[PDB]
Amino acid sequence: GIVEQCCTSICSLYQLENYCN
Amino acid sequence: GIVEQCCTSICSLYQLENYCN
Amino acid sequence: GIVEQCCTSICSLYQLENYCN
Amino acid sequence: GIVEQCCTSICSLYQLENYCN
Amino acid sequence: HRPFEKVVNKESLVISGLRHFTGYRIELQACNQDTPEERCSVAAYVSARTMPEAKADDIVGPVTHEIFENNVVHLMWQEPKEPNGLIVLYEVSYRRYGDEELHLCVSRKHFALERGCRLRGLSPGNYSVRIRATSLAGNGSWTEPTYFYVTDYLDVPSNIAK
Amino acid sequence: HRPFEKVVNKESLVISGLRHFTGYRIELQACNQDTPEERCSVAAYVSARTMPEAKADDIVGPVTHEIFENNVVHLMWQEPKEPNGLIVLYEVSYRRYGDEELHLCVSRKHFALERGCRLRGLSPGNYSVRIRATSLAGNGSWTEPTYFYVTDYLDVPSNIAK
Amino acid sequence: HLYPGEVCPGMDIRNNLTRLHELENCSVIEGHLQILLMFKTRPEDFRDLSFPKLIMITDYLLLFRVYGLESLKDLFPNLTVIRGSRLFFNYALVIFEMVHLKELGLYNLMNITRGSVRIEKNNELCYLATIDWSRILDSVEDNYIVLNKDDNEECGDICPGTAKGKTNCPATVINGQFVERCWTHSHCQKVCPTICKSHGCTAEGLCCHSECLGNCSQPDDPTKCVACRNFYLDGRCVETCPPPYYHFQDWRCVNFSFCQDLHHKCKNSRRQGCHQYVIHNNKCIPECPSGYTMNSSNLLCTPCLGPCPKVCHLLEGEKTIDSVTSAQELRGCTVINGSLIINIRGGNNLAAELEANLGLIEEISGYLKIRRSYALVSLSFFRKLRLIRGETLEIGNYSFYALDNQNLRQLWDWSKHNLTITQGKLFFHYNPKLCLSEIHKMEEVSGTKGRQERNDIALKTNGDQASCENELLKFSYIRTSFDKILLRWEPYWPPDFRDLLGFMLFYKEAPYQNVTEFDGQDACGSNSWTVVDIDPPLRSNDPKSQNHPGWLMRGLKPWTQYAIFVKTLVTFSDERRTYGAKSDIIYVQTDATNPSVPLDPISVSNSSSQIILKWKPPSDPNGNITHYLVFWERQAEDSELFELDYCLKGLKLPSRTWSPPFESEDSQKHNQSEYEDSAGECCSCPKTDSQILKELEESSFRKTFEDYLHNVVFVPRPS
Amino acid sequence: HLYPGEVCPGMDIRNNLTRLHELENCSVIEGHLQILLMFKTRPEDFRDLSFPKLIMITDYLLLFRVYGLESLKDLFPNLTVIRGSRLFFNYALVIFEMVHLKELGLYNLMNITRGSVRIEKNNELCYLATIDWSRILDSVEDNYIVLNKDDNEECGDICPGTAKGKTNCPATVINGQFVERCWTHSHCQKVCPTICKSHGCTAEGLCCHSECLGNCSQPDDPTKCVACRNFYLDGRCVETCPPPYYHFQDWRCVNFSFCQDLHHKCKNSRRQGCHQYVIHNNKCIPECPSGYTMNSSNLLCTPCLGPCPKVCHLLEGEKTIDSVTSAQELRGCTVINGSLIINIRGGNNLAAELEANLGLIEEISGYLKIRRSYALVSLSFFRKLRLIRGETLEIGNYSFYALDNQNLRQLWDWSKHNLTITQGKLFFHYNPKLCLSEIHKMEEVSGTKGRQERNDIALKTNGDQASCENELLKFSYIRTSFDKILLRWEPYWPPDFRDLLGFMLFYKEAPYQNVTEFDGQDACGSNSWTVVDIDPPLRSNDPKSQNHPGWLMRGLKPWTQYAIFVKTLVTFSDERRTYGAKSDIIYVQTDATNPSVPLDPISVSNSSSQIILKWKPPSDPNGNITHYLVFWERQAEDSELFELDYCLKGLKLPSRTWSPPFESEDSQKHNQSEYEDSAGECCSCPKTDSQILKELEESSFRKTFEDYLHNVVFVPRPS
Amino acid sequence: FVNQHLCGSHLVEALYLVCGERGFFYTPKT
Amino acid sequence: FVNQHLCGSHLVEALYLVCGERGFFYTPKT
Amino acid sequence: FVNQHLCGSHLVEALYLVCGERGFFYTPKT
Amino acid sequence: FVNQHLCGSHLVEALYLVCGERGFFYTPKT
């Protein structure tokens, strides 16, 4: 979950590379 | 304290049950 | 002791017999 | 409407920060 | 012994049957309570005098006089009883050289004092008046500024107040 | 500008070199940064009159008169340099044998009009001088209504000047 | 012919607009529709490409953060009304953080069915406070429409006040006066007769067919309307659907072939439906209620053998009920293979739909939990609940981990419920309007107080407001006056009189007896709560008591229904104690006096022998006024007249002549704030604090002294 | 000699006055006596005997439940002081539960050593505004006198002395009125100066030697003393025991033979509860210190090279610590084979004594406990405490249990306070003034904080009315005026900036420039720090906000320093993520200003040309006043004066001393133009007059909606 | 009372009324 | 003893009127 | 204040003290 | 991207500037 992933823990790039172009 | 005790400071009823007659 | 016996309950007479001669 | 904002109603510090350039 | 007048679920009243030119001091109180007995508040004293009209400002009675080679006039006039504000009053004073100046006031105290006020000096000669024109409502008789030769109430170069 | 003054951390200050019992005023401000401007507030305003001195109302220069040939006394002097505020009034009751005895209720303006007071035609016999000058104190040229004996149209010296 | 164009499922688009070319010119949608998150966008491309062939939708419509647009009538000029079936977060219309707009401009709505809206954080958009939802919505309070350029006090009204067609804007009446509503600077609102609009209303203002709705072309026919009420069929709006066609989705009615080919398909490789739609109660629905199953014979929810409950087994590790959508995800079911939570929020009072969706689950495998619901007041929706099993538990092996319900006045009516607990440790804190009485009763009907333990309850909390009670006091005697009130009531003497600390007198005004308990508002002073502490009385336990508790007044107003009650100053201990003692909320009239003249003694006349007067009552009500009285009187002309003349040096005037001109105030320009604070009532009013903590500790000091004394001085000597 | 009596130790006066045959000829005291338990008595029994042979006391004396017994001056006149070697629950003398107690005597007392007296519930007593205790105690903070006939507010107390017969009457004002300091209506009190107060005044001469005390039969004679500060031997007060003699219990010396047989009487075949006295420190004391024991017959203690711990197996498997009595019962114990409990009371500190008593102790075999210690502040007196080992726990495996401590705010500096709470839990509720970070340090030094669990520690408490914090605020710019002031400071963004809701500011006047470093006691407000909040700024710039926070204070007195500081206002946390943050305070002047008006002028003269002008300062003197500008002229000549005061007109009508117009004319514009602006000035308006509860809910609700949106849309795919 | 007091006729009324018919010591300014 | 609760003066009067005037005897404990 | 209205050239001096060195104007009601 | 914790509009804008064009999606196809 984004806010669980990001608004509590830090969301690095590799934590986010799934859904970019 | 029939008058002065109540008009020198705070008063109370237990004061006043005895100034009864 | 004392209050544990009688400041808790309506204790018995025997707890005052305990404080007898 | 700083005047209508604050002389006819309530205002704020930011509310007049904008009328400031 | 005093007026007793009552109002019923209102906030205004118009009392009537009133003398006029009367500033009435009003004691004012009220009672929610009537069955055991009334419990009425203090008297907020308040007053007002009635709206005046052209009712008695003008003079009640006839303005009259006398004529005398005694050099005197016993002047008279009737003053209204319900007076309208400032009573009209006509001051008079003449002058001749050598101890022959004259006078007549209209004022409530002077009327009460000198029975009006009494002229002294009526005889032929040069007799004139200063007239500060005064009438709060106008009248049928003023001092009527001219030069008033001592003949009688005659043509405007003579005594005139009517 | 206006006469100036400053203070050296007092709570009190005075003035002198000033006309006796004469009307001035106050403007006490509060300067806090005097150098770019006298940074002193609006003031706490108040007036003043203190310590009258009847000596000035009394004739600093005595007052003789003119013996007019019409049997009249015209009152002549030169008013003070400090007349003790303002010269107010005299008691000039005059009336007899008719109505021309020349009463004068005299201000600055009236004395300027007349340069004094011009009495009636003289009267050999007793004569009261109840004439008095009036500053705000009230002493003037007063002795009493002491009935001076006119001596064949003369000798009415109101010269005590108390 | 009312919904001619074909229907296309729900979908969203979040990129280039070519995904809007997917349509072969639809009319109405099934399923959710949203379009949001497009930056590289600009209002000119939206001038064209409006889709007016649309008619209606049912599910929620959401728009969010698409950069570049001015208004809506160049998008959806024909989009009738939104139903509510699956709201998003208890809301239907969500136009949120939409930038660049200037006015809404949407005229097709006239009566939205259910749900609510939020149109918020719009730093460009105006023309919403000139739009009336009162005549279109029923849940007109749950809607948060805020933080817009209408809210930030910038925009103006240029809505047509002269009929460009044949109407000025309607003087629609909300917010007090008539609000000269509009959607745009051009369009004006539509008003309709009250009952008639509920089944549509003409362009003129006439009623229409009962199954017509909203806009109607021909008044009083079922086929030339624009909207329907319940269903339709093949051209007309209806109330039913006889066979072979059967109800479907609360807006239409279909064929056996329709439902048939529905169940022949699924999300994936299953040509028999995973949510296979089937017939029952003449409705073509996806799955049966409890007590029914099916063999694939003719598409009817067949009655079954024994029960047939609904194990709505959740793939999650936990479930939240914070929205109605959660309820819909658990509507109709009756059983859990997991746990459950309530997390209601906001001043909404959602228990209605909850009891509509739920109030039918009565089996739980795991654990319950309730939190942080400022508007929640009861669990009355749980009118079926039987069991909270132990298959999983919260921290420390807990099951009913209740907490933080800042307005929960009470739980169910503990008179008709039968229920089970099997495992489970409890947990209760910050329940400031939950009564310890019903809590203990919940322990009694728990079926568990062997496993109940210490530290679970915070008796220092959980009922600190809105006094609950188990004991009572009474005014054994009362005697009063117009300004004073002497009260004498029965005593309380707990297991230790020493624990007593005094009494409170709650007292305050009230115009009628409609007033009620007031304990659980803000516990500070300014609550209309004038209160006072008084010391408790001498005991004289050895004789029979002849000195009851009492108190007497410092101030009152006459003829006042002063509501009054009390409460005891009590010492706390770690004991399942009584609440203490109170008395009921008695309402008491006060005796009589008028010492107050009424204000405004007018002074004027209206004729020569007539007068004119004004009275205005004191703020002292002084009984019910019954009549006034006056003692007027005359003044002869004083020596004020007989001390002057006016033939004199100059002239003066004691003013015999009329001069009450009825002046007024030009200096007293009291502007909109009609209030001042030259002085006041009690500035930083005296209201006690931890300054009384000292006295509490002093009484405890007294207790401890007597305790140590009475302990070591006496001693048993049997042995 | 001065001290001739026979050794007469403690005894209970109870249920029969015949026990004064134990006072057949006595004059000495040891331990205590107990005057109580006489219900069938009256003045005959207390005039049947009166035994004035006494000398003094050491520990205390007692009074309880005996009728009559008018006073003591007849009973025990020769009675000097109490040593306070023991106490009765933090008091050294009792006055309690007496009926028909007219007065007391005790006109022979000069220095009460330790503790205090206790007066209570003797409702027939007065003449106690003539009796100081600081002049009879070397320390007065804990004394406590209450509930007598004086608490009815009568007894004007005509005491003699300088009045009613000169009798060497030292009156001594202490508060604002001298008083004939005495004890009765027919006695007096003895005042000393510090020249000889240490060891006592005497009107016999003027002082005694400085090893006497209290009184002395001869002035300036070191053997004719009456009291001894330090010691005693052979007819004279001294200050040391010469070393063939040895010291026993603060009141004497004896020879080695005396101490050894005063033991060895009990060193025989009968246990009479006696004790193991041994010579040590030149002192015949009860037992051996640590690293000192005695298993021999050399009659002196001797150091075991190993540790000789002062193990003391508790009774009851526990003990409460409630008083200095319970404390002294363990001084000279270090290890506790038991479990202690600390339940202290009263507005009195005791860390001084406990650091003398408990300030050696190192090892509790079981657990600590803390309970409603009101006036306590610290574990400071626990300065050797290391090991609360895991062998005993309260209900729920607790190794530590603290609660209701309304003033605890810091334990230690953690320099090298190396402890181990080896096993077991914690418990913390209603522990407000103690920070959380300190508790976290306690869990750190503890070991496995993993032993902790949910709700083992509170988070809604413990730092409420003030607190330390982790991060600090700072400033960027300030600007000021004479009537207005600006502050603009740094912006703060928590990791979830939504969690923040604004800044909380505080300020005040402060001519005294060392004001509190306090957060704020906003308990129903109730603290005159005029506080107002502020909406937070935007997230406009993503790296760093170009808009700094700000709120403008205004309406302040000119040339007035002002303390100003602020602090966060944050959503109630869920884990130990942040303590908010704060700013320090700044004494800030207010700029100079032109318009202040001086008050109360004067205008009268001593002479005509003279005028005395005098005045006062303003209400706003505006700092350093340079000087007082002045103007005046002959502004006295209007046109209102040459045309007045004719003959029959008024004589002195324009006699205008203090002329009308220049004076400050009356006014009625209370607040119209620029003060109706400031019309939210108010009274009984709280300092927290805002239902932030609703606002907290609104913020949480918005967060819920946005989180729902984003966490739905974010990843509907694995890529 | 709190800062105000039991003077005037409030005093005498409440003084009679605290007992009613027992009687009281009449205390105008005792 | 008494059905009421025995705290304080309660307890003192109780022990009084239960004593029979012989009391509780402290044997020398040390 | 902001609790209630705010008028006069208090506004003017406020804007002067606040804005300062980034330029300020006003709708002159003065 | 910031190595601070991302939330709200900051998160939205940062995420767009991260992925940008033809990267990020709602997928009802799943």
Residue numbers in the entry:
A (entry chain E), B (entry chain I), C (entry chain G), D (entry chain K): 1 to 21
E (entry chain B), F (entry chain D): 756 to 917
G (entry chain A), H (entry chain C): 1 to 719
I (entry chain J), J (entry chain H), K (entry chain L), L (entry chain F): 1 to 30
Paper text:
The insulin receptor (IR) signaling system is a key regulator of metabolism and cellular growth. The IR is an extensively glycosylated disulfide-linked (αβ)2 homodimer with a modular domain structure. Each protomer consists of an extracellular ligand-binding α subunit and the membrane-spanning β subunit, which also harbors the intracellular kinase domain. Insulin binding to the ECD concomitantly elevates the receptor’s intrinsic tyrosine kinase activity before cellular signal transduction.
